[PDB]
């Protein structure tokens, strides 16, 4: 468990925050939000919870991600979770969080394949995290089922747009492997909001369920559909493994064995897997935080130059100075 790529950046944020708080001002540390776009049952929730490093989201066959859960990670001194609709309660166990999320979804949408545009706001405080926004959006579908209205397709798409047309957002586009990449909706959306690939990261899931004799070797090499940041393959837990309470360590070991043994992927083994995605996102955040330094320097330099002309005289103030008095008199 855990995510150790945060540890090397947290003290940088703290030091910058302290440097600005010294003057009664904040730091414009506008880190990008992370939005996970995907088709229904593409695996977009298991990827997200593998980036956080905690097993707390509901996942599984069927329509589970019924509401647009928004997770806020706030750096703190201890570890706890809270909900805006459960104000005053404290959650010390992620299993309770998962069960409460399910109960809150059912309470509003019912037991059919319902949806609700209103998000759930879950905030987790921990000394090991950064101030991040994570958005788990409901998967897109083509036809209504259950008691959904005829426009279910358009309501879901509209829920996505308000979160991915915003600047400073990473579109983490998840598509299954045992399907044809040309028919992945997540990539159609990315091309509608990021016409040139600067933020979009491709992730290919379900590589272990490919039809025997076929592989995706020409997809992972960024040949079929060029994407500025390529595609990162991952292997998540299967439905049997979720129901079997499979450990996370075993899943990572199985993923590593899969890539090391597969005849068509050995040469890419060091470019794929869960920990590689963690490094890519952490590197993306680090590149962002460094890119803003010229603005902070220019603001501070301008303020310093503005005050210096008067500081030069204030620093020379003395309780007894007949020349200072005379200068003021003449002026």
């Amino acid at each position: 468990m855990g995510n150790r790529g945060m540890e090397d950046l947290i003290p940088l944020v703290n030091r910058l925050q302290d440097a600005f708080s010294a003057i009664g001002q904040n730091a414009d540390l506008d880190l990008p939000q992370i939005a996970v776009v995907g088709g229904q049952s593409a695996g977009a929730s298991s990827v997200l919870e593998n980036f956080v490093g905690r097993d707390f989201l509901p996942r599984g066959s069927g329509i589970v991600t019924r509401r647009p859960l928004v997770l806020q990670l706030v750096n703190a001194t201890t570890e706890y979770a809270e909900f805006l609709h459960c104000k005053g309660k404290k959650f010390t166990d992620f299993e309770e969080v998962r069960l409460e999320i399910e109960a809150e979804t059912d309470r509003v949408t019912g037991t059919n394949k319902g949806i609700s545009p209103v998000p759930i706001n879950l905030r987790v405080y921990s000394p090991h995290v950064l101030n991040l926004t994570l958005v788990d959006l409901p998967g897109m579908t083509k036809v209504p089922v259950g008691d959904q209205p005829p426009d279910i397709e358009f309501q879901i798409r509209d829920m996505l747009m308000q979160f991915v047309t915003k600047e400073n957002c990473l579109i983490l586009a998840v598509s299954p492997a045992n399907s044809d990449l040309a028919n992945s909706d997540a990539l159609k959306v990315a091309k509608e909001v990021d016409p040139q690939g600067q933020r979009t990261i491709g992730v290919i899931t379900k590589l272990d369920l490919m039809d025997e004799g076929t592989d995706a070797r020409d997809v992972l090499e960024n040949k079929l559909l060029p994407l500025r940041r390529g595609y990162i393959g991952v292997v998540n837990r299967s439905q049997k493994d979720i129901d079997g309470k499979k450990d996370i360590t075993a899943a990572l070991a199985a993923e590593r064995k899969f890539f090391l043994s597969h005849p068509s992927y050995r040469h890419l083994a060091d470019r794929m897997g869960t920990p590689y995605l963690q490094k890519v996102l952490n590197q993306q955040l680090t590149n962002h935080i460094r890119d803003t330094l010229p603005g902070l320097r220019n603001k501070l330099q301008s303020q310093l130059l503005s005050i210096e002309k008067e500081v030069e005289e204030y620093k020379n103030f003395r309780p007894d100075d007949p020349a200072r008095k005379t200068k003021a008199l003449l002026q």
């Binding site: 030091r15 440097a19 600005f20 310093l304 005050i307 008067e310 620093k315």
Partner: peptide, 27 residues
């Protein structure tokens, strides 16, 4: 006037400290 002087000097030193920290953070 005394209060304005004191605030200007405090802000001056704090801004100098902020630059001395940011430059070291960038490395």
């Amino acid at each position: 006037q005394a209060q304005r002087r004191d605030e200007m000097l405090r802000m001056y030193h704090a801004l100098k400290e902020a630059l001395s920290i940011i430059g070291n953070i960038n490395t």
